[PDB]
Design a protein around this nucleic acid. Structure first.
Ligand SMILES: [Ca+2]
Length: 579
DNA sequence: GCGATCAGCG
DNA sequence: ACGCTGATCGCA
């Protein structure tokens, strides 16, 4: 129904200096995945190319790698990475419809061309799920059906660039697309393709030791419970705790008794078994998610894991990381932290370098709220998390453990993002009356933060959305909801999203500036991971001293705020040691 | 497939 | 009854 040329060879009119390009990778994880078909739409017509002909054609490969031949695409990182796995470089992507839709409205959840096109009343393209099917039925359709689908997707991109750019421009987001998110997409593609090397010998030894400890603890649990059961069965775990042993019920779920860690910790005075259950779960989590789960996704020939950073998923502008998630590798308990010993440089005599913004969202908050006291604190480079731990636990600076400071961190963020006296009292195991007074004291020291929390909710009501420093946007329809509980969740989103989102904007700019600086200095150092406000690199040991000066400076100077930004950084033989 | 749970970032 | 996530697991 849509006209196109099913081409048998590449012709010069397919190699124009502006085109919509589709390089179709159907598998969810695009690492080392098949490219099933290619479509090109430009001024001269519409073309479908089989990958075996197009990607072996030297002129088509050259066109893909020529940055002066501009391509408009949807999810260009998926294409870039799949092409890297084919030994082909993609350059010249000047418009990514996925990132444009994400910026316009992240709540749309746009995950294919059809969903983006619907934002602009364009419906002459099918959803990918209607074409490929779902689950066990998923399959590449017959070539004529595939070709028309890929051509229709390219035609949609070709038509949709201008109205998406026009709305981006009206939102003050066109530079956010072109100078931040699209350059970041190329950097993430390099990081994902580079991967992180894993010490599978050490990981597997840890797993064998874990399984022994797990059985020991499992037996002591059966013995403390007087009987055996399925320690992961709620119905059975609930029976043991809250019926057999008759422990108090502090919380319910929609489905029954709650056994979350906060509940178990409050029951520790009543019975030894709850601490064993906690230890059992923590070891099991390491075993299932971080030993077995990681070994599953290691590529055996290179011993590398290749995450996918989802750049158009979170509602605040953060990235997320999937299969494996390398943004939640354990660190806080020593037993879990040892997992990071398995993350190693990819070459001999290279090292891992990790750099982290200090108290990033409080510094962003001080800038946006213009709170005199919070700005003065960071101008003094005070550690507000430590200062809050001193006050909470009534200790001196010297006595603050990493654990008190971790807890004080949740108090600081809890309060500025709208925690109630009830929530605070439950977190600190303190009186509700004390919790409320401490919150009141907190806002006496930082009245500008209070004013900002009030103003930003009003602004979200008037405008219908909130923005970040670099003009990311999040619509909050529920902020005028008549339902108190629904309105309240929206109000805490108005409080949090501009801060968490501006911190996401800053580190993204930092990554672009860092990559350019590393290229300027002709260093071999390169990014491996981003963990929200931390950057993890690897480099030859001979570059470490230059990186100690280069990286903190690039990160500190990415933006200029009313308070300084501050970067902590370490390096070492494994990720474990980069602290 | 979903809810609880828990690993991380703030 | 602070916010943003992803993986595993049992299923009340
Ligand atoms: Ca930090």
């Amino acid at each position: 129904k849509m006209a196109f040329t099913l081409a048998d060879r590449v012709t010069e009119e397919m190699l124009a200096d502006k085109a919509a390009l589709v390089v179709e990778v159907v598998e969810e994880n695009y690492h080392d995945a098949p490219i099933v078909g290619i479509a090109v739409v430009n001024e001269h017509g519409r073309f479908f190319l089989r990958p075996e002909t197009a990607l072996a054609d030297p002129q088509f490969v050259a066109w893909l790698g020529d940055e002066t031949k501009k391509k408009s695409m949807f999810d260009s990182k998926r294409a870039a990475v799949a092409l890297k796995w084919k030994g082909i470089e993609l350059c010249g992507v000047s418009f990514d419809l996925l990132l444009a839709a994400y910026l316009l409205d992240p709540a749309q959840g746009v995950d294919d061309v059809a969903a983006a096109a619907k934002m602009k009343q364009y419906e002459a393209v099918r959803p990918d799920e209607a074409v490929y099917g779902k689950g066990a039925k998923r399959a590449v359709p017959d070539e004529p059906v595939l070709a028309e689908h890929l051509v229709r997707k390219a035609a949609a991109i070709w038509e949709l660039e201008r109205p998406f750019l026009d709305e981006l421009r009206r939102n003050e987001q066109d530079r956010l697309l072109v100078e931040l998110e699209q350059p970041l997409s190329s950097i993430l593609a390099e990081m994902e393709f580079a991967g992180v090397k894993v010490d599978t010998k050490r990981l597997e030894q840890m797993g064998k030791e874990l399984a022994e400890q797990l059985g020991t603890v499992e037996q002591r649990i059966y013995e403390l419970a007087g009987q055996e059961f399925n320690i992961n069965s709620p119905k059975q775990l609930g029976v043991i705790l809250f019926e057999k042993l008759q422990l108090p019920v502090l919380k319910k779920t929609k489905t029954g008794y709650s056994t979350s860690a906060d509940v178990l910790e409050k029951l520790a005075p009543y019975h030894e078994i709850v601490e064993n259950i906690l230890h059992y779960r923590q070891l099991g989590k390491l075993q299932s998610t971080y030993i077995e789960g990681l070994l599953k996704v290691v590529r055996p020939a290179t011993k590398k894991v290749h995450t996918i950073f989802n750049q158009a998923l979170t509602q605040t502008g953060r990235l997320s990381s999937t299969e494996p998630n390398l943004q939640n590798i354990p660190i806080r308990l020593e037993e879990g932290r040892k997992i990071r010993q398995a993350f190693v440089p990819s070459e001999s005599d290279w090292l891992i370098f990790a750099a982290d913004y200090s108290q990033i969202e409080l510094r962003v908050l001080a800038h946006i709220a213009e709170d005199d006291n919070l700005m003065e604190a960071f101008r003094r480079d005070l550690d507000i998390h430590t200062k809050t731990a001193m006050d909470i636990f009534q200790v001196s600076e010297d006595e603050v453990t990493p654990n008190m400071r971790r807890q004080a961190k949740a108090v600081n963020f809890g309060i500025v993002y709208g925690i109630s006296d009830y929530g605070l009292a439950q977190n600190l195991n303190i009186s509700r009356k004390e919790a409320a007074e401490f919150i009141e004291r907190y806002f006496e020291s930082f009245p500008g933060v209070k004013r900002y929390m009030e103003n930003i909710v009003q602004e979200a009501k008037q405008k219908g959305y909130v923005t970040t420093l670099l003009h990311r946007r999040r619509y909050l329809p529920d902020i005028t909801s008549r339902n108190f509980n629904v309105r309240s969740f929206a109000e805490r989103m108005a409080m949090n999203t501009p801060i968490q989102g501006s911190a996401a904007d800053i580190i993204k700019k930092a990554m672009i500036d860092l990559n350019a600086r590393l290229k300027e200095e002709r260093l071999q150092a390169h990014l491996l991971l981003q963990v929200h406000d931390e950057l993890i690199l690897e480099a030859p040991k001979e570059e470490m001293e230059r990186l100690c000066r280069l990286v903190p400076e690039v990160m500190e100077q990415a933006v200029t705020l009313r308070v300084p930004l501050k970067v902590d950084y370490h390096y070492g033989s494994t990720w474990y040691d980069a602290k």
